[model samples]
Target: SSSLKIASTQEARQYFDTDRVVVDAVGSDFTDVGAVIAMDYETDVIDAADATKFGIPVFAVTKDAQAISADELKKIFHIIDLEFDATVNAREIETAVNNYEDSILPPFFKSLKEYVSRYLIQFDCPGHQGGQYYRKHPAGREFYDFFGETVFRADLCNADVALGDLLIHEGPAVAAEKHAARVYNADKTYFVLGGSSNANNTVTSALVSNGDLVLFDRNNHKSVYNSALAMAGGRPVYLQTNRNPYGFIGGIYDSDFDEKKIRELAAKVDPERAKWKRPFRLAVIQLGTYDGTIYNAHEVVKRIGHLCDYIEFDSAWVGYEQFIPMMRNSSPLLIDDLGPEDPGIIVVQSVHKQQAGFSQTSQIHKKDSHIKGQLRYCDHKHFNNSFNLFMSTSPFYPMYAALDVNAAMQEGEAGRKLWHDLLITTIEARKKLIKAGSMFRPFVPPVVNGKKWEDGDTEDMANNIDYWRFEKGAKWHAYEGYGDNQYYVDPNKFMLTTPGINPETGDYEDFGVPATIVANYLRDHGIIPEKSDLNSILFLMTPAETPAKMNNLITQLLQLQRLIEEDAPLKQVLPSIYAANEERYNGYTIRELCQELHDFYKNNNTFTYQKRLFLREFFPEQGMLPYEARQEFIRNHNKLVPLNKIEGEIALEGALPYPPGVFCVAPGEKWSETAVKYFTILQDGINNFPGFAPEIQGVYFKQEGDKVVAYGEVYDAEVAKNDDRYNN
Candidate 1:
């Protein structure tokens, strides 16, 4: 007798606590299925071709067990080469049935492994030579040993990629993309070698041609800016996003989607330019923001889809949202539920960020002609040509294998089942976290005006997802520009607010608990947090986060809290922080570290501008797109200028201040008073903090004796005045 471990769906529970789902299956979804019991309907969900392709035998379960004679049943037993015995135990039958298995390993993954087994010497481009060079080289020996041999072999630089053509979608790669498309419910799914950052660029180039009008969320990742400026050469209209005092970004309101308002905002960016007022070509926004906020795409489509030619959602953070029902219902529902009259939908997902792919593994999911305009799957030439620009000529086989495997991992009911189970596991973790600590707090949804949700509370609001919805009338959610309801929070993402700071007033409550300090502690203890804000550390419960891991985390948190109560020695709690500043922090404690920072901010209330420095927006004023800025920088026409001086200065490149890394000065944008104050807030405010100084890209900090002065390279206004070649 053999004991079994199996994963299944809800409907499958109707019979034997079933190991696999019997129905609601899709093509290639039955990859590793043990056996199929087909009562009826072979053409629809049965997926006969897929079953045959997987080499799995499907049984006809049409008649009652009594009707099928013993000899006929004995013939069935011959399929798995098992001798049928009427007196055999049920457990023996189970073991024998599973003995004859089906389904080959993922194509690229299996083929690479097979190639490695052949022991053929690699005459490849990679200098490593199957990690062999690493073994001989003194320094690389440790590097190769750490990674092992398997990773290097799969790194398989283009010696003989007999697997298939990635660009033309020939053979193995063709099957892989199609399989992934089926799982994602897209007409086409293109594998991305670069991260989703490049996927954004690929889609932008493909959709928005030069001089095309595009709308953008001000709160998106910098790559979105790269797409609009660098790849597309499109005219931009920045949609003002929402943010609370805590620095959490939110989606736009109904007004931002209005064609007239969008047109007006478009004109505001470059009032004299003709490209500004053109019909909208594309609109890009993040699906799940850094703070774990999700938007109602179904509603977003209803409000904005018709106005624009295409709507692209950069869902890099929550790529696994496609698997969860609650998230899927809000996000990918637009592509499937809408018609050709609506704007075509595009979603770029970084599979490695959330799912089982390697780093930089991403996919661009597009409805294309299904909902509206663009290239059809019948002729993939145009999109593939566009994809070539962003993707590398020689792609990693490991990323490709990872993409193939992840697609199969979440096909049909399996996708739903896996995430559903993840939801349960994460929810339990949240429950334990809620009951554990007092000083720190888990993020809770805004209740009615007067009501509040405490950390140590028993409410299954996570399962009741609708409760977390940000409604229009809710007074606490009055982050400007988002009056309409279009966003919600991801339940799996938990933000635990550290002590010391008040959310509204930006004032300290007697003592301080900086999140950076706590986050460092977690990282030192091997419990790395997803993200950390000024006063909060965010945790995302992926498949890797287990009950035991969460239990350990809870214990650490409680131990730290008790240490604070005891005014524990700083040396004991934060040895590294203490060691770095040993002479000063020698006699100090955890409470002292928190109290000092809070006291510093409180006494010098100067550092916390715009409600703790995160709620500020980048200047909408742009004299040039980032692409033009880059071109100007490449030329020798740039000179380093002080941050306070606009004397003969037009920036050679945009200055994206750290933390809120959005472009404050797009390359050729003439330095102005507004720009000065914008940089002033970060430059002056951030530097004032003892250990935390802001990193302003392109803006160097010059050490003028004891004082630090910020400077950036810019186009010389004096030269521009003499020659008419350079002016906004």
Candidate 2:
């Protein structure tokens, strides 16, 4: 006989009512389960036996049933087999060597030697081994055969004239111009041999002199702060960001911070208010913060530009924005000009951070000539080549070629079409995952300003259909009264896996299962996502992403979902080929953790920055907290409010962690209660020990004093209230 679990709200109904058959409440409490069914009919389902006693029909429909058919099932199986073959094929490709090219290289190499011998190459060096041998011999051929021409062709020493001197003429001057043109679209580009760390220093030294006034965004990079200290005597006017306790990095809306906050803070610094014009002489801002949240660059520039002579954009990982439209739409402020004549903008891009450019390759684009000239001088003062060898020269042919090729490949109609196709494929894949009960989501961006508008049909849209809207800039803002209303994408949330499942659970356990375990499960079956961070899984779709691979991934995910639903043990099914990271921490189910973090932030009325780290340091005696072990963030950081009055007429140290990089948070900003809760959830994820990287500076623990204590670091209260809130 087929057994069925009938969930109903009415207690009056008796179901073979026996004590041993225990009809204990599952969805809600025992008493209110009846009310839950009556009030939420959408959740109820029916099950019945079919014609055959062995067969049964269950009507708990959510996803389409067709996707699980035998045909789709077979395709998934075939994909796994194909993947195994490809892995072996890839190994063969890597190990193979070419024999045909050996004979062809000698003559060309000899001809090149003769050509170089003809021109008495000056300026720097000549490599006849200082008159060693101009003759070609059999012994030489034997030696050449052992090694090959590849090593010799590339073996030009520093004295070799062909390889120009780096530090002086050939290095700084040439690199600066080339890099500036490539990244910032400047007539002149400066390449920073040092990483963003060094590039940041250069930007600071060039623009800021002793005693100069600079308006620094509270979330500016640490390099900016270090640069400020290096310059010495510059008065930094800090612009604070809005904090949300739930989200680690909250949205800093235009309306969140008013002139009143600025005025109040300013009054503390300069009683007269005459000494400063908003901030100082120059303003620096970071785009696409570290937590994966992005800022509206155009709007930010316009709002802050009026107060400063030069505005610097620290776009370290934004190199891909020029090519990827999705990234641009999410954080649409890169369109601003940073030219010498344009006083409003000065931009820097860490090309290697996003694009496949060479390591340490960066471009500083300038709209203001003054900043450009300052860049050159700063290069001369701060740049040194003794220790750095690889990133020593300009006109890096290989790096340039890679960037150029990437650009060329994405240039015309074909490239644009490919991008569009890639996006659609990714979206489709996400939809499939969702249907399979896999918890993944797209971090959708806001639409452009008003062009056209229409109300969506609820019934039609309920089937999950796409809609198009056209509107002007004003109309875009009008629709939501927030964000750029350009065009509405399917879901407004950015495309990433949800921090975890339901925010109400207040515990990590509800997040279904740990992503690590989930990732291992998928890999064993031969389908793999691109990268798996602490709590997230990234599915990268390049132009090379094929339909076959995508289909295989989808099929396997469905199978895995079924396995999980059937309660498969993680150890039995997880892949043996892979190993967990050495730094293994206890993993949490998302449901429980989310609720706890959310509550902690809500009650405290302040965004909890670095919760795990804070707890580990301050609450160390309490032992390892659950929230930090799993990278689960529940609170929103964009809306924190200050609960206790702490007198902070002081400057802030350290940048807040967001998606791209760490941004500095200013002291004395009044946070809202809701904002505080949101920020705390995000801080819980960050405060974990994982956030403690050596490269990051000022990774400190907030001192526990009489006035300041860890009050909102726990979330038990929020979980208890979830039931009431849901009922209400």
Candidate 3:
């Protein structure tokens, strides 16, 4: 039969993963395939890997083709021989009852589409009511054609009586939010539009009132820190993280969680405030760290839960952790047996970060783990205020629908399989990149249990999880003092450690390839990495990755390796570098520049530059709170002092450096000799090393003739008179 028919009836399309049905003329186009169909089974390209199971059903509508091999039979669920017209028969398979569970259905999306399906003539907030003005106007032809009609038509206001309120979550919005809660196993879920930053500030504002104390991982995002000072008026005590010799930020130490220590830390910061006897109001951590560490948040909760009223994991980067089996239960929300005794768990996740949502789609998960009586009702009401305060009155229905669809995609076993496939590719990439020659190496554990690892020993790490696990006093983690069984590295973060730094000794190697140089090379070739620290370049291995993608990265790395091995000159290796610094690199080779940087680092070894510059020191002297510092600075009482002229002056704002993107020093900290030493190093780089100065916040730079001068904002000691907040 040249003709074929495949229908989604009670007998055929009943898989849990059947969210879509695809009809391909060539039988090989499975771009977004859920259930694929063809006129004849095209074995050469479609489902080519008979052994590699994609685990989706493939159907053929025609018997005009020859019999597929026995091995190929496993790939295809069925090959129907019955005849039907291809034009009209696809309508029969659009939808089915009982094939999808309520958790897997997009209730709000369907409702919005259905409501908009029936045409209406009406008045609305949008002047382009269903894009009619744009569709009709001659000048708006490009605008109307750009997004197409349905996108503009589905752009309904939240106030529409035909739909639900996103703030109150009435109508189908209630169903969608409730379904999302079930899928994520949260007691409640609030959908947020536009920014994860908004969720951060809004969530904290609801919980952290004025003078509420906050305990934050020093590496927690800028949004949370801004929220503390600007929105919540909270006093934050930071838990310190360590840095590897390469300056990559590591995890928190176990001692950082000692409640007894913090009580005194707070005691010293302000005597009268500590006397008020307030426990920390909220404890926060960035769950999936930029350094590729995804903390076992349950273990963190075990340590800190009793000390705080609420515990939040800012899981912006690893929002898909719940959908990955190995990552499951690592987050607080995925813990099934959480009880009322546990501190309230708050997770603010960006749906677009690691999952299948449009940009700016975010959700907040609130769980009492509660046995909290009718107080649960009151708790929920306050939460709505937070929701309503942050959420826009005129929300984009398309963005709301995207949140609904992202949750629908990540429901049940189907969700885990999608993530599993994603990880499988990443794991293989990790294995390959580590073995793919010496120009760069994956930054794995250089030592385990005080013993340096051989190449063979390190090679085995890609296959095991133990190499990255945190153990007490373990140098492998490059951090001192941690309790065992608390944290693990995310395999999906592929960090290529370049050859300039010695992992074991923290010494500059005699010969080298700088990480940034390699990063620049890749950038010139159109590969943008997540970050490039001094010795390492990072690429996040995400859902979009496949073997071919990794191959491209490796191939470019191989090209860079070839340049090093062949002693390629600056013009051939990095033309831009050569062109920009023509006099400096008139005849220099890539190898020479590598050695030049290696020599520069080696020359600076006398200053213990790595330890002083990268192993950042904190200010210990008594000073104003960040809120007070900000207030005084706003009052025109702060002055900018050049780095060379600074002598025991207090800072008015924190200095933030790139790579880690966290504040190395916060406001109101008095400058110490150790900190001044770090500033000298930073200023030296700005003066001598072009393209080497990092984009630092809170540090001002100005040009004087041919030289660059760095400045730090200092508190005006003479003008700083005793005000109530300061004098008390």
Best model per lDDT: 3
Candidate 3 residues 74-148, lDDT tens each?
A: 666656555343433333333211231222458898787677778777587677888888978787878989889
The candidate with the higher lDDT, 1 or 2, is: 1
TM-scores, all models, native as reference: 0.80, 0.51, 0.82
What residue runs in model 1 are displaced by over 4 Å at the alpha carbon? 1-104, 127-129, 132-142, 157-161, 268-278, 371-379, 446-463, 473-485, 504-510, 583-586, 599-620, 646-650, 670-698, 721-728
Q: How do all the candidates rank in terms of TM-score, highest first?
A: 3, 1, 2
Per-residue lDDT tens digits of candidate 1, residues 1-728?
Answer: 21222222333223332332333333444544554433322223334523244334344332345554553443232121222322333344344346533133455665666677767787776777788888997789999889888888777655566777777677677788887887777888999989898898888887777777777776667787767765567766667666554456566655677766665566634552234333567878788777667887787777767667788888887776666656655666334556666777788988887777888899988776664344322236767888998788778888899999888766666455656666666656655665554566766554533454433223444345554666664544445555445777676676677776665553457877877777778777888887666566788766666678777887778877888889888788877666676775568777777787667555644333332222224343456665676666665666788877753367766667644455655555666555665566557645444344445685777877556778888875455456556543
Q: What is the clash count for each candidate, in the order shown?
A: 0, 113, 1
RMSD in order of candidates: 7.8, 23.4, 6.2
Q: State which candidate, 2 or 3, has the greater TM-score.
A: 3
